[PDB]
Amino acid sequence: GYRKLLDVQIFKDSPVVGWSGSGMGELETIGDTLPVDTTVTYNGLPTLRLNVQTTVQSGWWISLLTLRGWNTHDLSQYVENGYLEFDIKGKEGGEDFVIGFRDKVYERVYGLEIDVTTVISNYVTVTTDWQHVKIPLRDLMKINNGFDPSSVTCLVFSKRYADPFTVWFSDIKITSEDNEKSAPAIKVNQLGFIP
Amino acid sequence: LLDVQIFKDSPVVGWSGSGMGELETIGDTLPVDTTVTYNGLPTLRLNVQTTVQSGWWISLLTLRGWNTHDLSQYVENGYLEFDIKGKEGGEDFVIGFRDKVYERVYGLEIDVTTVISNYVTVTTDWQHVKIPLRDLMKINNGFDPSSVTCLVFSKRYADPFTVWFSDIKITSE
């Protein structure tokens, strides 16, 4: 029945509601969230820019991208076969940082919010060219330490090393099963005209 | 400034626990030891009973039964004081404070912490240790000292150990 689950789109073409910041303003932000790059594009669509401009020695920087404008979202049924997919490319290459999810459970008094994380390098080796990466949910959200996949609020990016860096994201979303995207068996001028 | 007594002679409302029950608790809070006394009063026993590999053990001691407490005027010259002594010695763990701010979306609760080894070397005899609040609550973290809810004790190493606290409180000038 997870196969009838629709994709959960986190970023497509516009500013995402959430909060991004750092101790000394190392992380580039606007309106306290990630800026949308209209110059570096993918498939003609704008990208999401994660830009740590100076060496990070405030100790930290974080980026929270909400799935439902801060409300919780039930993702339990995406865990056993789903993935976190997105395309990325670095300014140079070899960029690395923490990536995961955060939940919210008001009834867990010893910690209202818990995060599950991993390093992006474990699933890709960022280059200067676009790459499509798939992180598997079951690899993150396989608890025992409190995380509640039925109460997820945000996706998270976070400091790994203090090195400054820049990457661009595209088509960030949550899938329930596994795919190989595709395209019609068509011409660009199916339809006679081209939209 | 008025003192903010955290522990004196009775169970503290809060939540203490661990991934697999390594931390000795009762009613999900730290046991009050009545055989180990000091200055006539009972003591608070923090006891992880086995090499802990849940990943974690934590103790939240509320200052106001979960309500936030205003400790802003205490940051400058305030201290967190208490007396301590261990079962074997050299015991070390994380100690700090946790706040609660519902409208701060990037983190409803934030912890400001340090390790006791930075302030004292636990011996098998009573010892008094004063940690300046300025050493913890002075950050561009978003941590709000006027919204503090709990004192925190948490895992540092997976090694089991036992310590007793006494007269835990917050004092100023």
Side-chain angles (χ1 to χ4, degrees), chain B residues 69-129:
Chain B
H69 187 60
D70 195 1
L71 295 177
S72 55
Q73 317 320 148
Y74 296 68
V75 187
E76 291 308 328
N77 303 295
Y79 299 80
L80 162 68
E81 318 198 15
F82 62 92
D83 303 289
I84 184 176
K85 101 176 188 60
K87 163 180 79 181
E88 91 196 271
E91 289 86 0
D92 188 37
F93 51 83
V94 181
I95 180 174
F97 293 96
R98 173 167 296 189
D99 73 359
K100 186 202 217 177
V101 181
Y102 284 124
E103 341 29 286
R104 195 182 50 201
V105 293
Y106 60 89
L108 290 328
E109 307 175 279
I110 299 178
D111 284 345
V112 286
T113 67
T114 185
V115 287
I116 39 277
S117 52
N118 284 190
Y119 291 92
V120 286
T121 312
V122 182
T123 70
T124 304
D125 273 328
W126 285 106
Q127 205 169 5
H128 192 283
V129 4

Side-chain angles (χ1 to χ4, degrees), chain B residues 3-168:
Chain B
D3 276 0
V4 184
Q5 192 69 53
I6 300 172
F7 171 78
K8 182 212 170 192
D9 52 9
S10 55
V12 185
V13 168
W15 194 96
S16 293
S18 52
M20 308 209 271
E22 309 111 273
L23 178 72
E24 166 183 46
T25 67
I26 178 167
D28 287 327
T29 191
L30 260 39
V32 169
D33 192 320
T34 182
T35 81
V36 178
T37 297
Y38 187 62
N39 288 210
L41 297 168
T43 58
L44 190 57
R45 175 199 326 139
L46 177 50
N47 183 199
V48 22
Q49 297 166 326
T50 60
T51 176
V52 34
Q53 200 56 257
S54 40
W56 63 281
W57 70 253
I58 189 167
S59 176
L60 301 173
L61 309 174
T62 71
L63 281 48
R64 284 276 178 294
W66 296 107
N67 281 126
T68 57
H69 187 60
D70 195 1
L71 295 177
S72 55
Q73 317 320 148
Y74 296 68
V75 187
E76 291 308 328
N77 303 295
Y79 299 80
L80 162 68
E81 318 198 15
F82 62 92
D83 303 289
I84 184 176
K85 101 176 188 60
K87 163 180 79 181
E88 91 196 271
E91 289 86 0
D92 188 37
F93 51 83
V94 181
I95 180 174
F97 293 96
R98 173 167 296 189
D99 73 359
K100 186 202 217 177
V101 181
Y102 284 124
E103 341 29 286
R104 195 182 50 201
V105 293
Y106 60 89
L108 290 328
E109 307 175 279
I110 299 178
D111 284 345
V112 286
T113 67
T114 185
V115 287
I116 39 277
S117 52
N118 284 190
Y119 291 92
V120 286
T121 312
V122 182
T123 70
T124 304
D125 273 328
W126 285 106
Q127 205 169 5
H128 192 283
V129 4
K130 315 202 304 175
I131 298 176
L133 298 188
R134 40 173 22 268
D135 290 2
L136 299 168
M137 314 183 156
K138 298 290 294 295
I139 311 185
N140 49 57
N141 209 180
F143 179 82
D144 180 12
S146 69
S147 300
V148 179
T149 57
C150 305
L151 176 69
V152 198
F153 293 156
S154 51
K155 172 182 164 301
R156 181 51 180 172
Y157 307 109
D159 299 308
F161 67 92
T162 307
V163 293
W164 293 271
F165 302 82
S166 169
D167 187 21
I168 307 176

